Amino acid sequence: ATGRIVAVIGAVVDVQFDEGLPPILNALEVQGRETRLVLEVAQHLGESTVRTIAMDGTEGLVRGQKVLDSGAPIKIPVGPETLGRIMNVIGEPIDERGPIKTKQFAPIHAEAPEFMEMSVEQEILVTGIKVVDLLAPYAKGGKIGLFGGAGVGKTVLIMELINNVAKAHGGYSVFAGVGERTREGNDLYHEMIESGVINLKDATSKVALVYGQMNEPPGARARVALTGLTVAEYFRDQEGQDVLLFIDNIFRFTQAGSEVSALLGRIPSAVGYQPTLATDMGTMQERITTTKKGSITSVQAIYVPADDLTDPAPATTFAHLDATTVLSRAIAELGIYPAVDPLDSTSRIMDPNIVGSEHYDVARGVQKILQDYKSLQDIIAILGMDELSEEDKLTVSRARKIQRFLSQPFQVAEVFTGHMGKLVPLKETIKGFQQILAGEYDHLPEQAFYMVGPIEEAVAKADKLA
Amino acid sequence: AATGRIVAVIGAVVDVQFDEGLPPILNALEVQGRETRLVLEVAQHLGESTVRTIAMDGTEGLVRGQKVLDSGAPIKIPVGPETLGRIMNVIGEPIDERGPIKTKQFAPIHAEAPEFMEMSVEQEILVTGIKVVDLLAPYAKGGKIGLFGGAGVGKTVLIMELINNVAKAHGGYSVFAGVGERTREGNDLYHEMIESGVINLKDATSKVALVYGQMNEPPGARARVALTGLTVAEYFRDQEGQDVLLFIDNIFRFTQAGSEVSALLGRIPSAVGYQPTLATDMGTMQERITTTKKGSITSVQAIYVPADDLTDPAPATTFAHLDATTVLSRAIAELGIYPAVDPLDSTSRIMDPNIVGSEHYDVARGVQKILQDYKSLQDIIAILGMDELSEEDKLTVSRARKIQRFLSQPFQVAEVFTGHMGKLVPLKETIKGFQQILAGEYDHLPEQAFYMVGPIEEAVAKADKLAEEH
Amino acid sequence: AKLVRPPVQVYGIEGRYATALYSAASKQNKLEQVEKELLRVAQILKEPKVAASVLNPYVKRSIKVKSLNDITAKERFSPLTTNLINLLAENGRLSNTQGVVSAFSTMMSVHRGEVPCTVTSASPLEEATLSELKTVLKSFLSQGQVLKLEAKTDPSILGGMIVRIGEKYVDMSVKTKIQKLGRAMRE
Amino acid sequence: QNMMRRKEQEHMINWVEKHVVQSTIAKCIADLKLLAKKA
Amino acid sequence: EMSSILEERILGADTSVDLEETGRVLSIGDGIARVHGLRNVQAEEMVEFSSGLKGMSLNLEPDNVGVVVFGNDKLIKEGDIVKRTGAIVDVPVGEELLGRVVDALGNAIDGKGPIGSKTRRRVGLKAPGIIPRISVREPMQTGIKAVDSLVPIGRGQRELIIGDRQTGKTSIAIDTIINQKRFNDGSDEKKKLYCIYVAIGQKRSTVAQLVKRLTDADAMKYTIVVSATASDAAPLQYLAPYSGCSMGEYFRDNGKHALIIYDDLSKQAVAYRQMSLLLRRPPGREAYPGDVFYLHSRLLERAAKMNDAFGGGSLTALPVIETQAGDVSAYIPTNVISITDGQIFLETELFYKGIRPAINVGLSVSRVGSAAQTRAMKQVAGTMKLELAQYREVALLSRGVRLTELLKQGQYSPMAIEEQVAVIYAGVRGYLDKLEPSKITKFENAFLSHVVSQHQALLGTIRADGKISEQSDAKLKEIVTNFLAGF
Amino acid sequence: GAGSIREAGGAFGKREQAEEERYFRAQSREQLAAL
Amino acid sequence: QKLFVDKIREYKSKR
Ligand SMILES: Nc1ncnc2c1ncn2[C@@H]1O[C@H](COP(=O)(O)OP(=O)(O)OP(=O)(O)O)[C@@H](O)[C@H]1O
Ligand SMILES: Nc1ncnc2c1ncn2[C@@H]1O[C@H](COP(=O)(O)OP(=O)(O)O)[C@@H](O)[C@H]1O
Ligand SMILES: Nc1ncnc2c1ncn2[C@@H]1O[C@H](COP(=O)(O)OP(=O)(O)O)[C@@H](O)[C@H]1O
Ligand SMILES: [Mg+2]
Ligand SMILES: [Mg+2]
Ligand SMILES: [Mg+2]
């Protein structure tokens, strides 16, 4: 079927068909372009006219330009041949290594797994990060979301997780860069080549990369996450593999939809977002899941606009996650890194019957003492430290020591900090925090717990200060 | 009469096209072909021989082209003595399952307000038996009162206490209008009135008419049910000269109902999402609830305050329509004090020494002044502690706490909540008690003796019993 | 004054002007004359020279009104259609002219009693079977009704026939039966 | 056993559906006859 | 097997054809279909698209009908045929829905076959009026000490669970559902409570976890789970609460007692806002439609207690509301707070300070109150409430801390009302001030064990009589004194 | 803005209420024994 | 009766 362009507004293109109106979500190819310009049908306008979202720039489009219907949605190559390669939103290679020669192509639009396919296994996933493993531990096959404002450490944390989990991972991995820095994608590509996780010479590569970055028009930024989902879903279903899916940044998805929502002719919702924010997010996120056919452990960095966690996009994302690591700018200005907010990060396996009564008690006691410190903060700020009781001063001192000991030097942060990274086992974390809560280190200064690994390094640093 | 056709149905808004005889605005229209009665009130003439209407019931099952009949008048409800002891809905149908309300006259629920020459300047205190109300903001016979409060502060309990006290101390055909409130509460009030002889199922000598449009009703019904109750009360006032009580719970819903159709009536929103016509709608409804020279209407209205704002356009617009506003504070309800009346936020137009007397006025003003001074001293207490005030400051704080406790009073309708028994304190007893607590005659009694008692004699007795046991 | 509503309803600018013309012509019971005159003015304006001249926004409205007066008086048009075109040129809705015509046309299509009929089939049907089909479908209508049949062909129904008479609809395609059997076996 | 039954039955449904599609003016005759009985 | 697919699966299939009343899709987009024709369609009538999809006609306009699609609009094209079904939206109801997980329209999504339901019920029925109701007297037992003692819930009440994210709202609802097993297997028929959990806009794996938890405790045999998750169309998430409420009104109208949880109504409000904005209805506050209050009030009025003439059945409603940063003053929170018969406020500060469940007894109110408690619970709980208030005033103090640490409770452990009464007795009579606040919890466990091992007689007495007698008062007095001596 | 410290319900309003309640319960115990 | 054709023929085929 062939139609003709009748209107071009930004990323939105109206196409009028004389015969054979293409279904919604079909991919159309514009004729007369130097590169492949794909339009995805979004609405049927009536009078044999459809409204489409362009996957590339619409500059140079002329009213009346011919458009062919492919007969199917955007289909990307899926298989083990995509491992070690970089593809864009429409499945084309962008690594200059030639065609991705798979034996099967999958549409980026698919149905979410049914209710009878869901899994319930909730085994922990130790990450080596003290605050994560202690207070909001991740689960294998679960959904992890890293919230944070601009420049608080979402990319640093997700790169630390790639270093600590994906290399030690037995299955495959997919990194979907969505609306982020292109130089960050170049860094990740070359670092994965250096570390052997991507092999340019044989078929031993373990990661597939899908990049649509912040230089892309809103259609590509809205569908590149779906392309990454399709790759991970193939690896989960047809291969039965355990997949790792890193999405940085998923908020861009929502934001991209916002950018087109006005041009699609829809009445705006709260804060100018599309009225379909929650259902679009749900349609996308329900495919990011572990079924009883295969497992997908998902780590999604979630941008928080203007540091407002009540913004509709992060507020809607909160319900789709099994673990949330909420980074805070206030904690990042105290020098504590990672900037995890220990009273805002949660996990669903923080359950005595899952992590053990010892782990549960240490975590809950840490959170109790931090909440008590936060309650005292007002009086401490106005009436000074001296107007408290003895137990209040002891609580403040222990809470500050715990705040310091929650920080940790990362191996991805070695370059701009000099401090060698630390991977702290879960038992050593539980032991160190149990000991701090007990009072076994009430004599050491609080600066001794700042940016160390296990508690033995804390006592060594204490003996090195004095 | 005129017959039209339904051409549009969006939510609770129905556009009806007429061929001959466009009906005027505010007329009632009957939708033909329905098992139950569906009344559409005309709101706008859209041109093109079409009118836009608000439905008094649900619009499910309506078809484009369904026939509609013009009544030729606004919604007409039965009025008269035969409405007493009955429950009717927005359109005048009985909803107590006791048969048709057979009256000799029907009245339209849309009528003009009384003229300026019909006003009455007489003001006379209506003693309620509640200490804080009687003392700091007394009500007037034939005046509009208004009870402001958020969710869960005590508006319903207070209005039921006022019903009990006044409407049993009254012989003048009270009326209660339930506007957009809970149905469980309506059933509870109905059975309370049947049990307490105010409603008489057999031997029809009841003295209260009931009108109910509750939360499950569409916005049109909740917007017109207040006018239906108002119309019953207006008949009792004008067509009999009787002195009438009107209890509206809750009147905010009226305003709220309007908002819920505004955008569908084609109106640009105003501030806080309210209709542009909030003030004039509230005014045309409220200016009919008034005492004229023909008869008296004492109006007690519960007014919901969304999120405890009191600057929200609906309560802020209601404030100027009242003669004695009683404001219920959540901060006082959290102190355990009930009723939760705010002594520094409630105002009466008869709190005038040339109306109530110099002793009552002086006692009320002294109570308010000592409570304001207590508010001011609480900051110094917060920074310094209670052990650093001049002995006169400690005396002020002690007397202010005693006055706070003594302002609370156990209600008869709250015996299930409180446990205590109800008290109905006369006016001079209240004035004497507060005058004595202000003069210092009980600086030796503990503050907890004045809490949840009646007059000051009960305070002394409770102090004695406390001393004996403790 | 009371307005006479056409048997069918059309909305928008075109529908409003067509309802106006239908009322104003049924009052003088001159419906067929204005029908043919609207077809005439449609064929006139559709000609590219006029369709380019009088559909031009950067030439004055009064000039195009005068040219329309010329082209409607010169072709011996009734006062009804004459001041109808004058009204269209005054309000500036000349671009909607064809639309109005279309609307008017379909109104008359149901005033003559012409009901649309679609008969979708997997293959071109047989002519005697088509005549029997028209005969039996005559029975689905009241008096003063005529099938306007358009037996378009869709080979994806695999057999049978899908008939739509106005808004009535029978789905005798075999694909519907097979999908019902599938849903019955799976549920 | 239950899983085997379920998957075998699902493939039976799929096969019967695929294979009836591969398999007449009598169809149109009966269709016109039933449209005559539409009353 | 070639018999379960052909004996009657094909032999009986309703092969007859009908003369359908149809329209034609003018446009389709974002789950909204503008349809030409359909002259005689009713408002809120269920129509069917040519691809098996169903929709509801919400905007009856002069030139088109606005149909909301109960599915994916990917299968609808311009020009598709839309048939009438002649019926207003309705769902199957009955006892056969117990144990099943269904979607917003009543189709089984648990892979267990069709629900053998013969009764159908509209989703938009009107609530019972003033006359059919009677006061709320029977207690709805949650198994949670803080709730059952300080914020009691009766049968026929609407109690709101309102709080921030991850404060423990679903935990309260699930504890309440698990608790009803003691009564649903007993012999008293007027004490059985059939539960209904409506999941609105949730993750599908979260609902799977919840169904697993309900099957572990064997609570699924009397529970219906209605699931309209995040990938379901906005019409389905809009309609799930009403379908669940109809499934519960079935029990309410037959002398049985039901409990429904709406988890949560904020996501239903979001879905309704989406439908309304895509139907081009003008937005209001926070872009919500003007009648979102009506949306929730016409739903929460259908929870009611009936009188004897109408069966004596009831329907309790526990709506859930998620607030942002504790802003109770937001639009939908204030709407639902003004509707319901009380609220259970949960707090993040209380949660992290160790108070679990994080109920804020200062704000949490039950407008029904002691009217819906047992006499024993009232005896202990009036004093416990007074002392906890007095402790909050100065936070005596040791008794207050004892009661606070006594209100804490584990998860998925709903206690019986007799054991609750025994524990609150032990805590309110002074038997806990001799112990340090830290050990209180473990004592309770041991205590309960002892009491449920060698003192079933006193618990059965408290259970049958409903109140404590001075004899049984002295019995439990000496039991707890001996145990504290031995502890 | 009189009484705004207690009205804000912060860490200073709670301690103000605690101080008032402590002082006046001590005074009530002192006034009840002398009655 | 192509539905019965489906029934009978595909029963005899599956058997
Ligand atoms: N009484 C309790 N004791 C201990 N832990 C609890 C208790 N209640 C809840 N939790 C835990 O705190 C967390 C809160 O989750 P929960 O589902 O109960 O609340 P929620 O308000 O529904 O959260 P959300 O809606 O954001 O998913 C859970 O991990 C739960 O296990
Ligand atoms: N774990 C960390 N240790 C030390 N510094 C960090 C850490 N994480 C972030 N930072 C600091 O915050 C900056 C922003 O890092 P980045 O993760 O790219 O921000 P974003 O949240 O936008 O992804 C870093 O350059 C670094 O200076
Ligand atoms: N006078 C009172 N005495 C004791 N408790 C009261 C009193 N008034 C209200 N309450 C308590 O506050 C709750 C709210 O009652 P209600 O009258 O319905 O408030 P509102 O109508 O303003 O929402 C009551 O259930 C009761 O527990
Ligand atoms: Mg980043
Ligand atoms: Mg109330
Ligand atoms: Mg939850």
DSSP A216-283: S-HHHHHHHHHHHHHHHHHHHHTS--EEEEEEETSHHHHHHHHHHHTTTT----GGG--TTHHHHHHH
Rounded Cα gap, residues B350 and B175, in angstroms: 24
Our measurement of the distance from residue E321's CA atom to the centroid of its chain's CA atoms, rounded to an integer in Å, reads: 12
Phi, psi of A339 (to 5 degrees): -85, 30
User: CATH classification of E91-376, choosing from 1.20.120.450, 3.40.1410.10, 3.30.360.10, 3.40.50.300?
Assistant: 3.40.50.300
d(CA A380, CA A373): 9
Give the chain F residue nearest E391 (alpha carbons). F18
Q: Would strands C161-165 and C114-121 be described as parallel, antiparallel, or unpaired?
A: antiparallel
Tell how strand E139-140 and strand A242-248 pair up: unpaired
Alpha-carbon distance of B345 to B132, in angstroms, equals: 12
Chain E residues in contact with A322 (beta carbon < 8 A)? 205
The CATH number that applies at residue C97 is: 1.10.520.20
Closest Cα partner for B405 from E284, D25, F20, E209? F20
C contact chains, 3+ CB pairs < 8 A = B, D, E, G
Considering only the beta carbons, identify the residue of D9, D34, D38 that sits closest to E5: D9
- To which H or E segment does residue D10 belong? helix D2-22
B336 lines ligand 3 (CB under 6 A): no
Query: What is the rounded CA–CA span in Å between residue E157 and residue E154?
Result: 6
The contacts found for C152-157 with CB under 8 angstroms, 24 or more apart, are C152/C118, C152/C119, C152/C120, C153/C120, C153/C121, C153/C122, C153/C123, C153/C124, C154/C120, C154/C121, C154/C122, C155/C122, C155/C123, C156/C122, C157/C120, C157/C121, C157/C122
Nearest to B395 by CA among B439, B344, B458: B439
Q: Give the integer Cα–Cα distance in Å for D14 and C185.
A: 10
Alpha carbon separation from F2 to A316, B341, B387 (Å, rounded): 41, 19, 20
Contact across the interface for B375 and F3, Cβ inside 8 Å: yes
**B65–E367: do the CB atoms touch at under 8 Å?**
no
Resolution, angstroms, 1 dp = 2.5
Q: Is A386 in a helix, a strand, or coil?
A: helix
Please identify which residue in the block is written with the tokens 């939809």: A257
Give CA angle at B155 (B151, B161), nearest 5°.
150
Q: Check residue B84 and report its DSSP letter.
A: B
C136 closest CA partner among E16, D32, B265, E53: D32
Instruction: Among C170, C172, C176, pick the best mutation site for testing chain D contact (most D Cβ within 10 A).
Output: C172
How far apart CA A277 and CA A258 sit, in angstroms, is 8
Where residue B213 falls (left for φ over 0; alpha for ψ -120 to 50; beta otherwise) is beta
Question: Are E and B neighbours with ≥3 CB pairs closer than 8 A?
Answer: yes
Name E77's Cβ contacts closer than 8 Å, sequence gap at least 6.
A21, A23, A24, A44, E25, E28
What is the C-alpha separation between E322 and B313, in angstroms, rounded? Answer: 26
Indicate the residue type of E161.
I
- Chains meeting G at 3+ CB pairs closer than 8 A? C, D, E
Q: Which of E367, E375, E399, E402 is catalytic?
A: E367
List the single residue in E74, E78, E231 with the smallest CB-CB distance to A21. Answer: E78
Containing H/E element for C137? Answer: helix C127-137
Is residue B412 exposed (0-12), middle (13-18) or buried (19+ Cβ within 10 Å)?
middle
The CA distance from G13 to the nearest CA of chain C, in Å, is: 17
CA dihedral A270, A274, A275, A279 (to 10 degrees): -120
Contact between residue E44 and residue E122 where contact means Cβ atoms under 8 Å apart: no
Alpha-carbon gap, residue E270 to A274, rounded angstroms: 12
Q: Is the separation of the CB atoms in C155 and C123 below 8 Å?
A: yes
What is the distance in A from the centroid of ligand 5 to the CA of B249? 7
Distance in angstroms (rounded) separating the CA atoms of residues E48 and E38:
12
Binding positions of A are: 151-156, 180-181
CA angle, E352 then E353 then E357, to 5°? 70
Nearest Cα neighbor of B297 from B157, B83, B113, B133 is B113
B107 close to B77: Cβ distance less than 8 angstroms: yes
Q: Determine whether the shortest distance from the Cβ of B423 to ligand 3 is under 6 A.
A: no
Contact (CB<8Å) B448/F28 = yes
SS3 of chain E: CCCCCCCCCCCCCCCCCCCEEEEEEEEEECCEEEEEECCCCECCEEEEECCCCEEEEEEECCCCEEEEECCCHHHCCCCCEEEEEEEECEEEECHHHCCCEECCCCCECCCCCCCCCCEEEECCCCCCCCCCECCCCCEECCCCHHHHHHCCEECCCECEEEECCCCCHHHHHHHHHHHCHHHHCCCCHHHCEEEEEEEECCCHHHHHHHHHHHHHCCCHHHEEEEEECCCCCHHHHHHHHHHHHHHHHHHHCCCCEEEEEEECHHHHHHHHHHHHHHCCCCCCHHHCCCCHHHHHHHHHCCCCEECHHHCCCEEEEEEEEECCCCCCCCHHHHHHHHHCCEEEEECHHHHHCCCCCCECCCCCEECCHHHHCCHHHHHHHHHHHHHHHHHHHHCCCHHHHHHHHHHCCCCCCCCCHHHHHHHHHHHHCCCCCCCCCCCHHHHHHHHHHHHHHHCHHHHHHHHHHCCCCHHHHHHHHHHHHHHHHHC
Among protein residues, the one with the nearest Cα to ligand 2's atom 8 is A153
CB atoms within 10 A of CB B31: 25
Which residues on adjacent β-strands are paired with residue E366? E342
Chains D and F touch (3+ CB pairs under 8 A): no
Catalytic residue from among A75, A140, A167, A181:
A181
8-state DSSP, A19: S
Binding-site residues of E for Mg(2+) sit at 170, 263
What distance in Å separates residue C184's CA from the closest CA in chain G? 12
Question: How far apart are the C-alpha atoms of G13 and A185, rounded to whole Å?
Answer: 57
Q: Do A82 and A174 touch, CB atoms closer than 8 A?
A: no
- The answer to whether A190 and A213 have CB atoms below 8 angstroms apart is no
Cβ E6–G7 below 8 Å, yes or no? yes
For residues D4-13, one letter each, b for 16 or more C-beta atoms within 10 angstroms of the residue's C-beta and e for the rest, the string is: eeeeebeebb
Residues near B357 by beta carbon (within 8 Å), at least 6 away in sequence? none
CA-CA distance, A312 to A229, in Å (whole number)? 23
Using the atom order of ligand 3, give the atom closest to the CA of residue B161. Answer: 1
Q: How far is the CA of E209 from the centre of ligand 1 (A)?
A: 13
Task: Find the Cα–Cα–Cα–Cα dihedral E73, E78, E79, E85, rounded to 10°.
Answer: 30
Cα separation of the two ends of chain C? 60
Q: Is-contact A204 A158, C-beta < 8 A?
A: no
Contact of B286 with B226, CB cutoff 8 Å: no
DSSP C7-63: SS---HHHHHHHHHHHHHHHHTT-HHHHHHHHHHHHHHHHSHHHHHHTT-TTS-HHH
Binding residues of A for ATP: 151, 153-156, 181
Length of chain F counted residue by residue = 35
Which tokens is E164 given? 């921030």
Query: What per-residue string of b and e applies to B303-335 under the rule 16 or more CB within 10 Å gives b?
Result: bbbbbbebebbbbebbeebbbbbbbbbbebbeb
Q: How crowded is residue C10: how many other Cβ atoms within 10 Å of its Cβ?
A: 20
Q: How many other C-beta atoms can be found within 10 angstroms of the C-beta atom of residue C150?
A: 10
Task: At E451, list the tokens.
Answer: 């009491």
C-alpha distances out from residue A92 to A77, A188, A210, C26, E477, Å: 9, 19, 10, 65, 79
Is residue B20 exposed (0-12), middle (13-18) or buried (19+ Cβ within 10 Å)?
exposed
Tokens 């041109």 belong to which residue? B47
Residues of chain E neighbouring G3 (CB-CB closer than 8 A):
10, 13, 15
Three-state secondary-structure class, residue B213: strand
Which is nearest to E369 in space by CA: E382, E384, E354? Answer: E382
> What sign does the dihedral E286-E287-E290-E291 (CA atoms) show?
negative
Structure tokens given for A79: 């298989």
Q: How far apart are CA E448 and CA E428, in angstroms?
A: 16
User: What size, in residues, is chain B?
Assistant: 470
Do β-strands E314-322 and E365-366 pair in parallel, antiparallel, or remain unpaired?
unpaired
As a whole number of angstroms, the longest Cα–Cα distance in chain A is 84
Domains and CATH numbers, chain A: 2-74 (2.40.10.170), 75-347 (3.40.50.300), 357-464 (1.10.1140.10)
Ligand 2 within 6 A of A333 CB?
A: no
Contact between B372 and B352 under an 8 Å Cβ cutoff? The reply is no
How far is B145 from B143, CA to CA, in rounded Å?
A: 6
Rounded to whole angstroms, the maximal C-alpha distance in chain E is 84
CB-facing half-sphere around the CA of B160: CA atoms within 13 A:
19
Which of A270, A276, A351 faces E30 most closely, judged by CB atoms?
Answer: A276
Q: Which of 364-423 (A) contact F at CB < 8 A?
A: 375-376, 378-379, 382
Whose C-alpha lies nearest to ligand 2, atom 24?
Answer: A153
Q: How many CA atoms lie within 13 A of E337 on its CB side?
A: 27
Q: Is G9 on the interface with D (CB under 8 A)?
A: yes
E127 closest CA partner among E297, E247, E259, E260: E297
Does ligand 1 come within 6 angstroms of the Cβ of E357? yes
Q: Extract the tokens encoding E119.
A: 């009764």
Cα–Cα dist A6/A466, whole Å: 77
**C10 CA: distance to closest CA in chain B (Å):** 13
Give the gap in angstroms from C-alpha A154 to the nearest C-alpha of chain E.
21
Chain length of chain A: 466
Query: Which of G1, G3, G7 is the mutation pick for testing C, counting most C CBs within 10 A?
Result: G3
Q: What are phi and psi of B303, to 5 degrees?
A: -125, 110
Residue among E96, E88, E97, E91 nearest E120 (CA): E91
φ, ψ of residue A60 to 5 degrees: the values are 90, -5
Amino acid identity of residue C9, one-letter, is Q
B444, F35: Cβ pair inside 8 Å?
Answer: yes
Strand order in the sheet with B174-179: B87-88, B208-213, B174-179, B243-249, B296-304, B147-149, B324-327, B347-348
Q: Whose CA is nearest to atom 25 of ligand 3?
A: E367
DSSP bridge pairs for B246: B175, B299
Q: Identify the helix (H) or strand (E) that includes residue D3.
A: helix D2-22
Instruction: Give the closest residue to A135 by CA, choosing from A444, A378, A369, A303.
Output: A369
- List, as ranges, residues 5-34 from C with C-beta within 8 Å of D: none
Tokens of B443: 């600086």
Alpha carbon C110 to chain centroid, angstroms: 9
Q: Which atom of ligand 3 is nearest to the CA of E366?
A: 25
**Exposure b/e, A301-339, CB count within 10 A at least 16 = b:** bbbbbeeebebbbbbbbbbbbbbbbbbbbebbeeebbbb
Q: Do C185 and E5 touch (CB under 8 A)?
A: yes
Give G4's contacts in chain D (Cβ within 8 Å).
none
- The Cα–Cα gap between C33 and B423 comes to 89
In B19-58, DSSP assigns E strands to 28-31, 39-47, 50-55
The answer to the question of whether B152 is labelled as a binding residue is yes
Q: What residues sit around ligand 4, an ion, with C-beta below 5 angstroms?
A: A 155
Give the structural domain span for C91: 12-110
Q: Report the C-alpha gap between C100 and C80 in whole angstroms.
A: 14
| Among candidate residues B68, B3, B18, the one with its CA nearest the CA of residue B39 | B68
| CB nearest to B186's CB, from E44, E130, E293 | E130
* Sign, CA torsion E445/E449/E455/E456: positive
Q: Is B155 a catalytic residue?
A: yes
Among A178, A219, A214, A212, CA closest to A13: A219
Positive/negative CA dihedral, B109, B115, B118, B121? positive
Tell me the two tokens of residue A294.
Answer: 């295969």
Instruction: Calculate the alpha carbon distances from E423 to B143, E141, E261 in Å.
Output: 54, 16, 28
Contacts of B49 in chain C (CB under 8 A): 3
Chain G closest CA to E120's CA: distance in Å? 30
